């Protein structure tokens, strides 16, 4: 069925005579941007007219060339087809650059999220692939293989970012084979990573702050850090940059729990990473929230001291969880 | 290539045919490729019933990878009838071969290496600088050995592949590099565990980073980034001078910067590491302080206090930028 559906997506794209609007999810990541650019370039080499509305984050701005990605679409072009990647088309609120609730043309979808409703004129959803870019590569082969370096490179970038440079346990042998194909097509791995290593002054100044509120507590097995808007003002950064430090704190030794705490002032908004025989969703269901399986995310509308005490009690609760299991 | 496959075959042949002990060696201060290649070949050779000694000193950050008592201390003499299997280094470069003294040995030597400077002289050998990790080539040798594959063999070879390619990020990564990773992963290489263990940072790392970042400085409008580390900072952090080595690179990553400078202040002298981009020559700046190097990567040791040294480094920086802009 994977093969048959990759084929149906590609056939629908090949058969479409009008413009093709290529879309991904709001706040696009490397997989989103990379899948949209790879598919867009492949379709343009075949002579398709493509619109790709997307707001490029700065750390990814080296990749698009002028006029490849546009501002959000005012209105849908006549005879358009929508190719939605790395997100569910049945979730318009999460699809950025065009409003799918105002469109009635054919819709095609390529996604690797298990939450997908699996409803489109032609679609392929495969949670066992760790990046939509892998799936888009298979579509491009099914389109007639319009390969070039310009197509391969953005797809390799999305393979990279969605697997954390081939570090996550989602990486299968098939993931590596796809990277081998992409490299043979010309993907510029060295250039990609020289570009992805660049960091703004904001990053360093904010990481000086983030580390300023760091403590190795619980006798040595839990780490905790904290960020306020003054710290953001002194670093010259934004709140969407604090989401690059909880990963580094999970990496601490002799520890089990790495807690980030965003302190807007009138509420605390947590990100609680962990590792080992400790779960971080038995603290996100012990003070409320949502997420994925090992992740977390809980908002306490109190001030700073109180929310942290609530969190510490929930952590001793996961501690009894460990003492029991 | 037939040459490559013939030499892989000759190396496996010499290993299978040898009746006595096989001493498996790599270079001093082993990296992930050295340890991972030594462990993969040693484990494979043991499933074929061979007597293997693997003398190696493992650095702390890699000590998760060997089984306890899998490696030995350096050999103070050679077992009778031994063969030396030298990986990830040239056997004609004995100073760099750690764990045994190859100038005292004249039994059979086998070599598996991927550096171009290798003299290519061994009783059986294969050198291929187009392979980005010796662990790739060791995997090919294990195929030619006929040894049973398993997670124990595949996992250490996967680490060497990771560490020598920078997690598949260097320009040396080829299609066949990824084809090798796929094959290792299919054999059970524990990719998640490996990257967990490689990102296990002691408290010292974070404290030292805070201190280093505490002295970070952006100068000349972002073009120049600069910091330093002294003994007080290492005392406060519980850190070593060794841990001050991944910092000149994290600084070169600063956007808009054409020059990164790290200064190590030992009380009586200051060692400067300089990296530059675009038109800025780190060499000219280093030569002005008494040092030198390549155009984008240079160094100098000034025998003074940090204050005196910094003033002279600022002066040398101003001249270089002034030359660049006047061009
Ligand atoms: Mg995404
Ligand atoms: Mg994705
Ligand atoms: Mg090496
Ligand atoms: Mg090597």
Numbering used by the authors:
A (entry chain B): 10 to 334
B (entry chain A): 8 to 334
Task: Quote the study's own text.
The full-length DrRecJ-like protein, free from any substrate or product, was successfully crystallized in space group C121. The refined DrRecJ-like structure comprises three protomers in the asymmetric unit, with two of the protomers forming a dimer and the remaining protomer forming a dimer with a symmetrical protomer from a neighboring molecule. Two catalytic metal ions (Mg2+) coordinated by conserved histidine and aspartate residues (H34, D38, D40, D95, H121, and D171) were observed in the catalytic core. The second ‘H’ of the DHH motif (H122) was not directly bound to the catalytic metal ions. Although our crystals were soaked with the putative product, AMP, before being frozen, there was no AMP density in the map. This suggests that the open state of the DrRecJ-like protein has very weak affinity for its cleavage products. Like other structurally characterized NrnA homologs, each protomer of DrRecJ-like consists of a conserved DHH domain, in which five stranded β-sheets (21345, ↑↑↑↑↑) are sandwiched between a series of α-helices, and a conserved DHHA1 domain, in which six stranded β-sheets (123465, ↓↑↑↓↑↓) are sandwiched between a series of α-helices. According to the structural data, dimerization of DrRecJ-like is mediated by hydrophobic interactions between several α-helices (the α7 and α8 on the DHH domain, and the α10 and α12 on the DHHA1 domain) of protomers.
Members of the most radioresistant bacteria genus, Deinococcus, possess two DHH/DHHA1 family proteins, RecJ and RecJ-like.
